[PDB]
Amino acid sequence: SGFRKMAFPSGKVEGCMVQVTCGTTTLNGLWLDDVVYCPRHVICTSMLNPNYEDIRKSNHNFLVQAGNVQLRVIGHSMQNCVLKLKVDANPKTPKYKFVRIQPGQTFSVLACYNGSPSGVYQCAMRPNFTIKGSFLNGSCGSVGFNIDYDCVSFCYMHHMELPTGVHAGTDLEGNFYGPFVDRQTAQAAGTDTTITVNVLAWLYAAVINGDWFLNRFTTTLNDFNLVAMKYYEPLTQDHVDILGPLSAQTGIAVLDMCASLKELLQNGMNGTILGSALLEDEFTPFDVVQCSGVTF
Amino acid sequence: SGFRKMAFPSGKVEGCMVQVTCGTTTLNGLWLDDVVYCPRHVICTSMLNPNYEDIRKSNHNFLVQAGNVQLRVIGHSMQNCVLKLKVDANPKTPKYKFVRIQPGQTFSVLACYNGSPSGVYQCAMRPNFTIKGSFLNGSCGSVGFNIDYDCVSFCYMHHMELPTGVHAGTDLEGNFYGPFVDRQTAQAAGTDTTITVNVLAWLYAAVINGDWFLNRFTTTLNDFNLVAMKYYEPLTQDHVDILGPLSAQTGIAVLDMCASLKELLQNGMNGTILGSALLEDEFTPFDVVQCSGVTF
Ligand SMILES: O=C1CN(CCOc2cc(Cl)cc(-c3cc(-c4c[nH]c(=O)[nH]c4=O)cn(-c4cccnc4)c3=O)c2)CCN1
Ligand SMILES: O=C1CN(CCOc2cc(Cl)cc(-c3cc(-c4c[nH]c(=O)[nH]c4=O)cn(-c4cccnc4)c3=O)c2)CCN1
């Protein structure tokens, strides 16, 4: 019983975190096999308008740090906005792949400073391709991940905080989420929306755990999106399908839960669900399927 | 920027989790040096009223499981409600101690099934000595911990879920938090209260991160506890003292923040703080001092 914002165990990722120094700038890097991944803005100084291709550095200009042992850069390259440092092969490398996630998907974040992990928490790729993270200076290079069976699927590396306090970064192959670029120019987070399918999944979690917000109506998929728009991401057929298992375990049809969400949006909560006074949207259907016990 | 429910990295604890089987019952155990700690109710069958001292088992009756390698019990004893299994010495043992925490203190929980970690989350020892955890069957033996410098301070082992859905367990030396006992008899969680000093710490976090709820009044410590009682744990001088650093970093005196909390309790929120629509009370002052960057 209960329901918590739950991160994957961070152990297989702690063994990969390292320090990357270049000049005066130090940030975090990720050590997988003999390659070290980190944000390319680690070669930067001033930054107002860097031409990153601008070839002026040597291998021996990058100091890598794996605890106390110092690593030796033997080759370097740049892939998109990520720097890849070949070094003379981490024994603690797990099974891992790099994946680029869709907005609305969740992951765990291992926040790190000077290559030393500090904490772990959950968050979602918002529909506007920012993440509401928790990051201070020197956190760049912290990564976000999911763990499936025994495989670490890396999906985020932190690069940047925006003026509204949310965060932007890239997949592990260096492609930013959103329209953001790694330079010190004005860039704002776009208008955000609420992740409907995830709110719905969370209502099913509330039901699985034994809880008032239900009602007797239904709605059409179209009529539901009409109301949602007024407050929320349109809900697709594929969303309905994805909510399938949760609907069968609970015997509440997807479109009945939508009618419930409709009412909750129209009348407010009048006073909490799973310990929350607002509609949470950072649990996926997969995340909810914690109520069942999946380990790794 | 940002503020999240943040767990310690769970890596130093994942290396300690094992399986403990006795008869038909399997649960989780903790492997430190050559000793394996687990809930003593693992020797039980029926349970309506066990006399645990009742000596009838052999060493070879306990099957320990460290991944795939099977461990051999060479000695056993019982300390309070925890069983200690001597086995033929975990290479992955960290620096660790056992501490028994005061109510209102927070810790991370590594939820585990069949000795395999499943997830990590934060929670607090409630004033009624329960924890609002997230636990399914087979979670018994999962532990809760804090990490200071490089030392894992274990403070909780899970034993039991109560009918209201909250959870009860022991320190790692087997002493239950609260008046609970490990047998299948009627036992209810007592009336709970809100952890005032932690609400206050969270308001300071809101201020550190740049946020409306402040006002110009003050209050006496006595006058504050008067109002709190009507809604909250009395706030002591020692609490005020503990809030010292946060008050100096922000330039808002403790008793000014209390006046703010007074107003917030009297008038509600009128519509969120740090992404929450209710007054959060599972961050300590220490936890808030994430806004500063402490790693381990
Ligand atoms: O309008 C706007 C205005 N912004 C201007 C600021 O531009 C950038 C661009 C880029 Cl590529 C990176 C950063 C950035 C660098 C560093 C950093 C620098 N040096 C070190 O040695 N260690 C470090 O960690 C840290 N953090 C940061 C701070 C707090 C939380 N999380 C990330 C950055 O955000 C900042 C752009 C967005 N849109
Ligand atoms: O009024 C009341 C009524 N209660 C009656 C129930 O009593 C107990 C007593 C004791 Cl000592 C332990 C449990 C208990 C055992 C097991 C368990 C059993 N066998 C296995 O093989 N694996 C397992 O995990 C699991 N969980 C449990 C379930 C869900 C979440 N987290 C913990 C228990 O809670 C239950 C007492 C409280 N107050």
PDB file of C-alpha atoms in Angstrom, chain A residues 2-173:
ATOM      1  CA  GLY A   2       0.978   3.657  -0.469  1.00  0.00           C
ATOM      2  CA  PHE A   3       2.210   5.528  -3.547  1.00  0.00           C
ATOM      3  CA  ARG A   4       5.434   7.541  -3.797  1.00  0.00           C
ATOM      4  CA  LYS A   5       7.499   9.383  -6.386  1.00  0.00           C
ATOM      5  CA  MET A   6       9.857   6.439  -6.885  1.00  0.00           C
ATOM      6  CA  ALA A   7      13.258   6.507  -8.589  1.00  0.00           C
ATOM      7  CA  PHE A   8      15.099   3.478  -9.875  1.00  0.00           C
ATOM      8  CA  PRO A   9      17.995   2.336  -7.671  1.00  0.00           C
ATOM      9  CA  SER A  10      20.868   4.602  -8.714  1.00  0.00           C
ATOM     10  CA  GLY A  11      23.678   2.114  -8.087  1.00  0.00           C
ATOM     11  CA  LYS A  12      24.502   1.072 -11.650  1.00  0.00           C
ATOM     12  CA  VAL A  13      24.879   4.798 -12.557  1.00  0.00           C
ATOM     13  CA  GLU A  14      26.924   5.951  -9.558  1.00  0.00           C
ATOM     14  CA  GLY A  15      29.728   3.669 -10.786  1.00  0.00           C
ATOM     15  CA  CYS A  16      29.852   5.647 -14.049  1.00  0.00           C
ATOM     16  CA  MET A  17      30.097   9.210 -12.768  1.00  0.00           C
ATOM     17  CA  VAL A  18      33.407  11.025 -13.195  1.00  0.00           C
ATOM     18  CA  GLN A  19      34.826  14.533 -13.258  1.00  0.00           C
ATOM     19  CA  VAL A  20      35.785  16.345 -16.449  1.00  0.00           C
ATOM     20  CA  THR A  21      38.024  19.396 -16.217  1.00  0.00           C
ATOM     21  CA  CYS A  22      39.131  21.664 -19.068  1.00  0.00           C
ATOM     22  CA  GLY A  23      40.843  24.897 -18.100  1.00  0.00           C
ATOM     23  CA  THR A  24      38.903  26.561 -15.280  1.00  0.00           C
ATOM     24  CA  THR A  25      35.619  24.710 -15.936  1.00  0.00           C
ATOM     25  CA  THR A  26      34.796  21.437 -14.187  1.00  0.00           C
ATOM     26  CA  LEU A  27      31.560  19.503 -14.602  1.00  0.00           C
ATOM     27  CA  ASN A  28      30.359  15.896 -14.524  1.00  0.00           C
ATOM     28  CA  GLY A  29      30.974  13.209 -17.098  1.00  0.00           C
ATOM     29  CA  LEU A  30      29.645   9.739 -17.764  1.00  0.00           C
ATOM     30  CA  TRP A  31      32.138   6.841 -18.006  1.00  0.00           C
ATOM     31  CA  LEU A  32      30.935   3.898 -20.120  1.00  0.00           C
ATOM     32  CA  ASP A  33      33.522   1.360 -21.383  1.00  0.00           C
ATOM     33  CA  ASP A  34      36.534   3.484 -22.467  1.00  0.00           C
ATOM     34  CA  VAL A  35      34.461   6.592 -23.427  1.00  0.00           C
ATOM     35  CA  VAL A  36      33.563   9.584 -21.223  1.00  0.00           C
ATOM     36  CA  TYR A  37      30.498  11.646 -22.215  1.00  0.00           C
ATOM     37  CA  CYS A  38      29.964  15.225 -21.038  1.00  0.00           C
ATOM     38  CA  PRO A  39      28.477  18.555 -22.192  1.00  0.00           C
ATOM     39  CA  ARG A  40      30.596  20.140 -24.908  1.00  0.00           C
ATOM     40  CA  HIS A  41      30.267  23.546 -23.271  1.00  0.00           C
ATOM     41  CA  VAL A  42      33.054  22.297 -20.944  1.00  0.00           C
ATOM     42  CA  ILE A  43      35.590  23.600 -23.493  1.00  0.00           C
ATOM     43  CA  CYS A  44      34.108  27.103 -23.273  1.00  0.00           C
ATOM     44  CA  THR A  45      35.412  30.233 -21.567  1.00  0.00           C
ATOM     45  CA  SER A  46      33.744  33.605 -22.252  1.00  0.00           C
ATOM     46  CA  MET A  47      30.164  31.477 -24.689  1.00  0.00           C
ATOM     47  CA  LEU A  48      28.239  34.541 -25.853  1.00  0.00           C
ATOM     48  CA  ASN A  49      28.488  32.921 -29.288  1.00  0.00           C
ATOM     49  CA  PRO A  50      30.807  29.902 -29.441  1.00  0.00           C
ATOM     50  CA  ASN A  51      31.796  28.142 -32.641  1.00  0.00           C
ATOM     51  CA  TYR A  52      32.365  24.770 -31.048  1.00  0.00           C
ATOM     52  CA  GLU A  53      34.080  23.181 -34.094  1.00  0.00           C
ATOM     53  CA  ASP A  54      36.726  25.807 -33.496  1.00  0.00           C
ATOM     54  CA  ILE A  55      40.135  22.042 -33.005  1.00  0.00           C
ATOM     55  CA  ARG A  56      42.260  24.236 -30.780  1.00  0.00           C
ATOM     56  CA  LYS A  57      42.506  21.708 -27.894  1.00  0.00           C
ATOM     57  CA  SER A  58      44.754  18.680 -27.295  1.00  0.00           C
ATOM     58  CA  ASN A  59      43.913  15.350 -25.654  1.00  0.00           C
ATOM     59  CA  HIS A  60      46.071  16.353 -22.670  1.00  0.00           C
ATOM     60  CA  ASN A  61      43.903  19.479 -22.203  1.00  0.00           C
ATOM     61  CA  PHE A  62      41.081  17.387 -20.651  1.00  0.00           C
ATOM     62  CA  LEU A  63      41.573  16.102 -17.105  1.00  0.00           C
ATOM     63  CA  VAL A  64      39.292  13.171 -16.229  1.00  0.00           C
ATOM     64  CA  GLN A  65      38.726  12.087 -12.607  1.00  0.00           C
ATOM     65  CA  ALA A  66      37.373   8.680 -11.513  1.00  0.00           C
ATOM     66  CA  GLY A  67      37.316   9.018  -7.727  1.00  0.00           C
ATOM     67  CA  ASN A  68      40.978   9.540  -6.908  1.00  0.00           C
ATOM     68  CA  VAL A  69      42.498   7.712  -9.880  1.00  0.00           C
ATOM     69  CA  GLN A  70      43.077  10.170 -12.726  1.00  0.00           C
ATOM     70  CA  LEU A  71      42.202   9.054 -16.240  1.00  0.00           C
ATOM     71  CA  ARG A  72      44.155   9.846 -19.390  1.00  0.00           C
ATOM     72  CA  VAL A  73      42.409  11.192 -22.480  1.00  0.00           C
ATOM     73  CA  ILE A  74      43.820   9.434 -25.548  1.00  0.00           C
ATOM     74  CA  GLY A  75      41.256  10.691 -28.095  1.00  0.00           C
ATOM     75  CA  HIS A  76      38.410  13.197 -28.412  1.00  0.00           C
ATOM     76  CA  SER A  77      35.507  13.967 -30.712  1.00  0.00           C
ATOM     77  CA  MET A  78      32.277  15.926 -30.614  1.00  0.00           C
ATOM     78  CA  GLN A  79      28.875  14.424 -31.384  1.00  0.00           C
ATOM     79  CA  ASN A  80      26.226  17.193 -31.549  1.00  0.00           C
ATOM     80  CA  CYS A  81      26.347  19.058 -28.212  1.00  0.00           C
ATOM     81  CA  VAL A  82      28.068  16.184 -26.357  1.00  0.00           C
ATOM     82  CA  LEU A  83      31.829  15.659 -26.067  1.00  0.00           C
ATOM     83  CA  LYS A  84      33.208  12.089 -26.170  1.00  0.00           C
ATOM     84  CA  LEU A  85      36.593  11.501 -24.491  1.00  0.00           C
ATOM     85  CA  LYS A  86      38.419   8.276 -25.253  1.00  0.00           C
ATOM     86  CA  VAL A  87      40.476   7.222 -22.215  1.00  0.00           C
ATOM     87  CA  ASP A  88      42.993   4.437 -21.639  1.00  0.00           C
ATOM     88  CA  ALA A  89      37.583   0.932 -19.621  1.00  0.00           C
ATOM     89  CA  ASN A  90      35.358   1.362 -16.495  1.00  0.00           C
ATOM     90  CA  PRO A  91      35.057  -2.037 -14.735  1.00  0.00           C
ATOM     91  CA  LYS A  92      31.678  -0.897 -13.333  1.00  0.00           C
ATOM     92  CA  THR A  93      30.002  -0.443 -16.753  1.00  0.00           C
ATOM     93  CA  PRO A  94      26.458  -1.939 -16.759  1.00  0.00           C
ATOM     94  CA  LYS A  95      24.281  -3.122 -19.596  1.00  0.00           C
ATOM     95  CA  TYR A  96      23.131   0.181 -21.062  1.00  0.00           C
ATOM     96  CA  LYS A  97      21.726   1.844 -24.114  1.00  0.00           C
ATOM     97  CA  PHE A  98      21.058   5.411 -25.191  1.00  0.00           C
ATOM     98  CA  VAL A  99      17.431   6.254 -25.930  1.00  0.00           C
ATOM     99  CA  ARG A 100      15.725   9.515 -26.821  1.00  0.00           C
ATOM    100  CA  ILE A 101      12.395   9.707 -25.020  1.00  0.00           C
ATOM    101  CA  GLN A 102       9.046  11.212 -25.980  1.00  0.00           C
ATOM    102  CA  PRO A 103       7.616  14.075 -23.919  1.00  0.00           C
ATOM    103  CA  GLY A 104       5.445  12.824 -21.066  1.00  0.00           C
ATOM    104  CA  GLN A 105       7.859   9.993 -20.242  1.00  0.00           C
ATOM    105  CA  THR A 106       9.484   9.856 -16.804  1.00  0.00           C
ATOM    106  CA  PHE A 107      13.015   9.073 -15.661  1.00  0.00           C
ATOM    107  CA  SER A 108      15.231   9.194 -12.595  1.00  0.00           C
ATOM    108  CA  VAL A 109      17.938  11.843 -12.187  1.00  0.00           C
ATOM    109  CA  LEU A 110      21.200  11.250 -10.329  1.00  0.00           C
ATOM    110  CA  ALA A 111      22.307  14.756  -9.362  1.00  0.00           C
ATOM    111  CA  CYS A 112      26.117  15.006  -9.136  1.00  0.00           C
ATOM    112  CA  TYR A 113      28.729  17.590  -8.185  1.00  0.00           C
ATOM    113  CA  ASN A 114      32.428  17.195  -9.064  1.00  0.00           C
ATOM    114  CA  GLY A 115      31.641  13.655 -10.223  1.00  0.00           C
ATOM    115  CA  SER A 116      30.245  12.680  -6.820  1.00  0.00           C
ATOM    116  CA  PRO A 117      26.546  11.709  -6.743  1.00  0.00           C
ATOM    117  CA  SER A 118      24.462  13.870  -4.410  1.00  0.00           C
ATOM    118  CA  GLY A 119      20.872  12.595  -4.681  1.00  0.00           C
ATOM    119  CA  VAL A 120      18.241  10.900  -6.830  1.00  0.00           C
ATOM    120  CA  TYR A 121      14.702  11.966  -7.827  1.00  0.00           C
ATOM    121  CA  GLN A 122      11.969  11.426 -10.437  1.00  0.00           C
ATOM    122  CA  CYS A 123      10.766  13.825 -13.051  1.00  0.00           C
ATOM    123  CA  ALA A 124       9.172  13.978 -16.461  1.00  0.00           C
ATOM    124  CA  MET A 125      10.068  15.355 -19.840  1.00  0.00           C
ATOM    125  CA  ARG A 126       7.483  18.133 -19.942  1.00  0.00           C
ATOM    126  CA  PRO A 127       5.545  18.695 -23.160  1.00  0.00           C
ATOM    127  CA  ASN A 128       7.638  21.841 -23.721  1.00  0.00           C
ATOM    128  CA  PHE A 129      10.861  19.715 -23.584  1.00  0.00           C
ATOM    129  CA  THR A 130      12.092  21.186 -20.299  1.00  0.00           C
ATOM    130  CA  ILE A 131      12.395  19.248 -17.060  1.00  0.00           C
ATOM    131  CA  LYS A 132      11.462  20.565 -13.606  1.00  0.00           C
ATOM    132  CA  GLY A 133      14.704  19.303 -12.084  1.00  0.00           C
ATOM    133  CA  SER A 134      16.670  20.154  -8.969  1.00  0.00           C
ATOM    134  CA  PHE A 135      20.071  21.453 -10.059  1.00  0.00           C
ATOM    135  CA  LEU A 136      22.728  23.837  -8.792  1.00  0.00           C
ATOM    136  CA  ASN A 137      25.864  25.162 -10.426  1.00  0.00           C
ATOM    137  CA  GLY A 138      28.271  22.358 -11.308  1.00  0.00           C
ATOM    138  CA  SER A 139      25.456  19.881 -11.925  1.00  0.00           C
ATOM    139  CA  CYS A 140      25.971  19.883 -15.712  1.00  0.00           C
ATOM    140  CA  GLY A 141      26.721  16.365 -16.893  1.00  0.00           C
ATOM    141  CA  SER A 142      24.304  14.736 -14.436  1.00  0.00           C
ATOM    142  CA  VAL A 143      22.286  12.151 -16.376  1.00  0.00           C
ATOM    143  CA  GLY A 144      18.730  10.825 -16.285  1.00  0.00           C
ATOM    144  CA  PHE A 145      17.874   7.183 -16.810  1.00  0.00           C
ATOM    145  CA  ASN A 146      15.416   4.315 -16.683  1.00  0.00           C
ATOM    146  CA  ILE A 147      16.292   0.736 -15.695  1.00  0.00           C
ATOM    147  CA  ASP A 148      14.619  -2.123 -17.575  1.00  0.00           C
ATOM    148  CA  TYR A 149      15.435  -5.614 -16.388  1.00  0.00           C
ATOM    149  CA  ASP A 150      19.159  -5.029 -15.766  1.00  0.00           C
ATOM    150  CA  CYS A 151      19.733  -2.452 -18.537  1.00  0.00           C
ATOM    151  CA  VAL A 152      20.315   1.235 -17.825  1.00  0.00           C
ATOM    152  CA  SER A 153      18.555   3.232 -20.572  1.00  0.00           C
ATOM    153  CA  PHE A 154      20.164   6.688 -20.431  1.00  0.00           C
ATOM    154  CA  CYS A 155      17.916   9.421 -21.782  1.00  0.00           C
ATOM    155  CA  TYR A 156      19.056  12.807 -20.429  1.00  0.00           C
ATOM    156  CA  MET A 157      22.216  14.774 -19.735  1.00  0.00           C
ATOM    157  CA  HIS A 158      21.915  18.132 -17.985  1.00  0.00           C
ATOM    158  CA  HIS A 159      23.362  21.223 -19.730  1.00  0.00           C
ATOM    159  CA  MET A 160      21.500  24.341 -18.736  1.00  0.00           C
ATOM    160  CA  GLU A 161      19.022  26.081 -16.465  1.00  0.00           C
ATOM    161  CA  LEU A 162      16.485  28.487 -17.979  1.00  0.00           C
ATOM    162  CA  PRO A 163      15.439  31.802 -16.386  1.00  0.00           C
ATOM    163  CA  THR A 164      12.143  30.325 -15.103  1.00  0.00           C
ATOM    164  CA  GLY A 165      14.165  27.802 -13.091  1.00  0.00           C
ATOM    165  CA  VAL A 166      13.424  24.735 -15.196  1.00  0.00           C
ATOM    166  CA  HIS A 167      16.142  22.781 -16.929  1.00  0.00           C
ATOM    167  CA  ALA A 168      17.150  21.812 -20.452  1.00  0.00           C
ATOM    168  CA  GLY A 169      19.562  19.254 -21.786  1.00  0.00           C
ATOM    169  CA  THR A 170      20.214  16.566 -24.349  1.00  0.00           C
ATOM    170  CA  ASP A 171      19.975  12.892 -24.999  1.00  0.00           C
ATOM    171  CA  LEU A 172      23.258  11.055 -24.553  1.00  0.00           C
ATOM    172  CA  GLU A 173      23.980  11.523 -28.275  1.00  0.00           C
TER     173      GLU A 173
END
